[PDB]
C-alpha cells in the first residue's frame, strides 16, 4: 500500500524511528468495572440529548471545566511531574511511588488569597515570606533539593513536622522552624518538593529534632534518603507538591538577616585562556610564515 497523505508516512516514520532496531540509529546512541457501566449509561444519555446534538452542529457547545479537573484527579499523572523534575532521584535515590492522597499546597499571601503551589510551579521567594498551608496520623517534611550551596547531595529543610495527628498540622511537633526560601543567585530555578509520608506508628524522631529557632546551615543540611531509610519501615510516601523559585530581593534578606551570611552568587566558570607556545629560537622560520602565526598579518 502507498500512503495517500504525507502524515501517514510521517506518523509511521515517527513511530518507526521511536522503536529500537538491530541496525545502529540515532535513538540508541542518544537514548472499577461497575463504574464503567455507569459511565456508559451517561454516554448514551449524553449522545441521545437532542440539545447537545444541536449545539455540536451549531458549534456552540460548552463544558463545565472545573468539574473535569476534580473528576480527573490524578495519582498516575501526579507521579509523572515529580519523576519528570527529578524529585525521586534526588529524594529517594530513584525510588518511585505513585502518590495516592491528592496533596495540594499553597503559599499564603496576605489574607485575600493563598498562592497555589502546583507540580512544577514557579513561586518567588518574596511570596514565600511565611509558611504555606498544606491540605491519618502521618508526617510531613520540607526540602531544598538544589538550594544547597556547598554539597550537591545535601539539602536544607524549611520546616519538618512529625506525628501529625490525623490531618490537623497545628499539633505536629515543630522539629524544624520555618525558614523563607534562600535560592542562590545565578543558579536559575531551584526546585523545592513537599513530601507526605504515611506513618505506620507514632515514633519519636529525636534524631530529626532541631533547635527552635535554628539559623545554622551546618545543622539544616540533611539527606532525605538516609532519613527515609532509617524510617522506611514505617514511612511510605503518598503526597507530592513542588515549586520552583528564582533569586529575589527577599533572598538577600533571608541570607543576611537570619541566615547571617553573605549572599551566594554563582555563574558558569570559563576555562583558562589558551596561549600558543612560541619557540624560543625560530630556526629557519621566515617572517611570512611567522606573520600568519602571529597576530600581525
Amino acid at each position: 500500500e502507498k500512503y495517500r497523505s504525507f502524515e501517514r508516512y510521517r506518523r509511521r516514520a515517527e513511530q518507526e524511528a521511536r522503536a529500537p532496531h538491530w541496525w545502529r540509529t540515532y535513538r540508541e546512541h542518544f537514548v472499577r468495572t461497575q463504574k464503567l457501566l455507569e459511565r456508559k449509561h451517561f454516554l448514551r444519555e449524553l449522545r441521545a440529548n437532542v440539545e447537545e446534538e444541536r449545539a455540536a452542529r451549531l458549534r456552540t457547545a460548552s463544558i463545565p471545566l472545573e468539574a473535569v479537573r476534580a473528576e480527573w484527579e490524578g495519582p498516575y499523572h501526579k507521579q509523572r511531574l515529580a519523576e519528570y523534575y527529578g524529585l525521586y532521584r534526588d529524594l529517594f535515590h530513584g525510588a518511585t511511588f505513585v502518590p495516592w492522597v491528592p496533596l495540594h499546597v499553597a503559599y499564603a499571601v496576605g489574607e485575600e488569597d493563598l498562592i497555589p503551589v502546583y507540580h512544577g510551579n514557579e513561586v518567588t521567594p518574596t511570596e514565600a515570606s511565611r509558611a504555606p498551608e498544606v491540605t491519618s496520623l502521618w508526617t510531613l517534611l520540607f526540602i531544598n533539593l538544589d538550594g544547597h550551596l556547598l554539597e550537591p547531595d545535601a539539602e536544607y529543610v524549611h520546616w519538618l513536622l512529625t506525628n501529625i495527628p490525623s490531618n490537623r498540622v497545628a499539633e505536629g511537633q515543630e522539629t524544624c522552624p520555618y525558614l523563607p526560601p534562600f535560592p542562590a543567585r545565578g543558579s536559575g530555578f531551584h526546585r523545592f518538593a513537599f513530601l507526605l509520608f504515611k506513618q505506620d506508628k507514632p515514633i519519636n524522631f529525636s534524631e530529626d529534632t532541631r533547635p527552635s529557632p535554628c539559623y545554622q546551615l551546618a545543622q539544616r543540611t540533611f539527606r532525605t534518603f538516609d532519613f527515609y531509610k532509617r524510617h522506611q519501615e514505617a514511612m511510605t510516601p503518598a503526597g507530592l507538591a513542588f515549586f520552583q523559585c528564582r533569586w529575589d530581593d527577599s533572598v538577600t534578606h533571608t541570607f543576611h538577616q537570619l541566615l547571617d551570611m553573605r549572599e551566594p552568587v554563582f555563574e558558569f566558570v570559563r576555562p583558562p585562556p589558551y596561549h600558543p607556545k612560541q619557540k624560543r629560537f625560530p630556526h629557519e622560520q621566515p617572517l611570512r610564515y611567522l606573520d600568519r602565526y602571529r597576530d600581525s598579518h
Partner: protein
Amino acid sequence: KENEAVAPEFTNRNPRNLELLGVARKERGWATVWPNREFWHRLRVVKTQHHVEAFVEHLNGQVVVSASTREWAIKKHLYSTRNVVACESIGRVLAQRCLEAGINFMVYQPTPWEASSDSIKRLQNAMTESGVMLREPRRIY
C-alpha cells in the same frame, strides 16, 4: 559563621534549570530531516476515528502533559469525542493540564491540512487564551 561556608560552584540538579534559563541544548542536527528539532517540547494532536487527543511531548518522545477525550472527566461533560468544539475543549483542558504541570512554553508545528482545519485553529485559540505559548523561547549559547 558556619552559614557563610559555601562551595565555589553551585550544584543545580533540576532537569529544567537549563531549559527554563534557556541554556539547555536543542537538537541542531538532522539538517537532512524535516522538520527542525530545535524545540524542547512539542504539541502532538492525534485525531482518531472516534476520539481526538492532544499531547505535549519532549524531544525524548515521552509525553509530560497528555490530554485525551478518552479521559473520563472530560468526556462526561463533552458531547462527542470527535467534534470541532471537542478540539477547543481538549486544548483548554490540555492547557489546564499544562497549567498543572508547570509547562508554559511549547512548539506547535501543524501540518498543511491540520493548520487549515478550523477545529485545530480554535484549539490554538484555546491554547493562547489559556496562556500556553505555541512557540518556545530560543536557546542560549
